[PDB]
DNA sequence: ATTATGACGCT
DNA sequence: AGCGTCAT
């Protein structure tokens, strides 16, 4: 009842750019703009690995992970864009660099948390409180928010996808309430306000389209962008869960899309994220531990509290390369050049980020993966990073790892080596 | 032979 | 610390 707390405290909405590698390279290259497009990695074998694909080059069947010449298959006038390749590895740089200039026009209006090279979360609490202050109890038209959707709407008592978008907005806006500057669906409407200046500032600074969802919480938030993409935001209330929820596969929420998800669903005999709602907290953690449990007790009643970081800077800088099939490392030269090569890169990286960013990375992580071993990492050290050297940083590396070579012989490396990571970690000022 | 990252949880 | 999970 009245002591029933309902998660609706913060607006929070996260923005992610459309096909965003795709987005730079059109950018750069006019010749791709509106056209079936990929960015690929590498060309050799199978004609490189698909990292993203532009909306109608996914009309196709065009996908990430696919190989360029199967994309090809389906899409004969795919245009494809090569990463550039430096030091004999991809060089992801370019996307990095436009990601940053997306990261500081979004930092203008709000903190953000970088949650990934092309998405960030905000939190629009104070915002919306200062806006709604700004209104002065004044109606929102439905003019100010011309991209926006709103989950559930329109119910009840029409041919075309724009009407029906307007059809549910004017439904929404005919329910607010805006005498109350403390109704949370108001709040979110506002939120929803400054999202569309926000995604309207990176399009006419960047060139570049993104969408984004509004809602009480990063989850929902997160959700609620995938819902209308691209180019488009969605509004994701906490009176919308109920019915979003009940035929929602449990994958789709973040944190579930793998083996907890999976437990879930098996232990419980469930598909739904809203069937969750019939168990007890206690029942809950008994079957996924505490943390899970609470979360998945709160998450399926549309709560969430985890809080947007003020963080628009990575926490790591790596640098890593996979050697497959019969590629992999076997000779101690090799392995000392790829160390070298990835630290080279690593020490460009770091040079850059410490004069941008006035902060010193102080632990070198080594990972690597040898052939057989189905994981992702085989062995992974940390040492001491004291200068930013790449000879010395490689050294150290080599250093770390040379006792994973079984080969009796000096020379050779057995069992080869099929993936070498560098991370630079432990950031401190400077 | 899916590749290149990045964040965070567990013990 | 080193390993695992999850995302994409
Ligand atoms: N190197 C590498 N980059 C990846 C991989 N997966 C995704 N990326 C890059 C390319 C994407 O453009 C970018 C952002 O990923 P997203 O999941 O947000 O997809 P994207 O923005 O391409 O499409 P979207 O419109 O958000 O569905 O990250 C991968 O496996 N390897
Ligand atoms: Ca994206
Ligand atoms: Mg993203």
New binding site residues.
């Given amino acids: 009842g009245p002591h029933m707390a309902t998660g609706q405290d913060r607006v929070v909405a996260l923005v992610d750019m459309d096909c965003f590698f795709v987005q730079v390279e059109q950018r750069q290259n006019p010749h791709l703009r509106n056209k079936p497009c990929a960015v690929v ?2 060309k050799s ?1 199978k004609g490189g ?1 698909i ?1 993203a694909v532009s909306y109608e080059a996914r009309a196709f069947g065009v996908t ?2 696919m190989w360029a010449d199967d994309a090809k298959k389906l899409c004969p006038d795919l245009l494809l864009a090569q990463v550039r390749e430096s030091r004999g ?2 060089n ?1 740089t370019k996307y ?1 660099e436009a990601s940053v200039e997306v990261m500081e026009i979004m930092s203008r209006f709000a903190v953000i948390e ?1 949650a ?2 092309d998405e960030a979360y905000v939190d629009l609490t104070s915002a919306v409180q200062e806006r709604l202050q700004k209104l002065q109890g004044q109606p929102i038209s439905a003019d100010l928010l011309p991209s926006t959707y709103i989950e559930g709407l329109p119910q009840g008592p029409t041919v075309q996808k724009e009407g029906m978008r307007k059809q549910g907005l004017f439904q929404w806006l005919d329910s607010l309430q805006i005498d109350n500057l403390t109704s949370p669906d108001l709040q979110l409407t506002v939120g929803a306000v400054i999202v569309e200046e926000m995604r309207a500032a990176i399009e006419r600074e960047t060139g570049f389209q993104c969408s984004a969802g509004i809602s009480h919480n990063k989850v929902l938030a997160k959700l609620a962008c995938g819902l209308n993409k691209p180019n488009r935001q969605t509004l994701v209330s906490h009176g919308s869960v109920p019915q979003l929820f009940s035929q929602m596969p449990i994958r789709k929420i ?8 999976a437990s879930v669903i098996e232990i419980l005999g469930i598909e739904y994220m809203g069937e969750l709602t019939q168990f007890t907290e206690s029942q809950l953690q008994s079957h996924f ?1 505490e ?2 449990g609470s979360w998945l007790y709160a998450m399926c009643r549309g709560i969430e509290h985890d809080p947007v ?1 003020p963080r628009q800077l ?9 050697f ?4 992999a490392l076997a000779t101690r030269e090799q392995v000392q050049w790829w160390l070298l090569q990835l630290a080279q890169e690593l020490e460009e990286r770091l040079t850059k980020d410490r004069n941008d960013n006035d902060r010193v990375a102080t632990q070198l992580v080594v990972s690597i993966r040898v052939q057989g071993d189905k ?3 085989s ?4 040492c001491a990073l004291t200068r930013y050297d790449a000879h010395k940083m490689s050294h150290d590396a080599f250093t770390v790892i040379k006792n994973c070579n079984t080969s009796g012989i000096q020379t050779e490396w057995s069992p080869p080596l099929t993936m070498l ?1 560098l991370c630079a970690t432990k950031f401190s000022a400077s």
Avoid: E
């Fill in positions: 990695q590498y074998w690995g990292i990430r992970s590895k991809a992801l990095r970088r990934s090279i973040r944190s579930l899309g793998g083996k907890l998800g531990g943390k899970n970081k990575p926490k790591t800088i790596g640098c890593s390369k996979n497959p099939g019969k590629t994981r992702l990492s062995l992974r050290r940390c990571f």
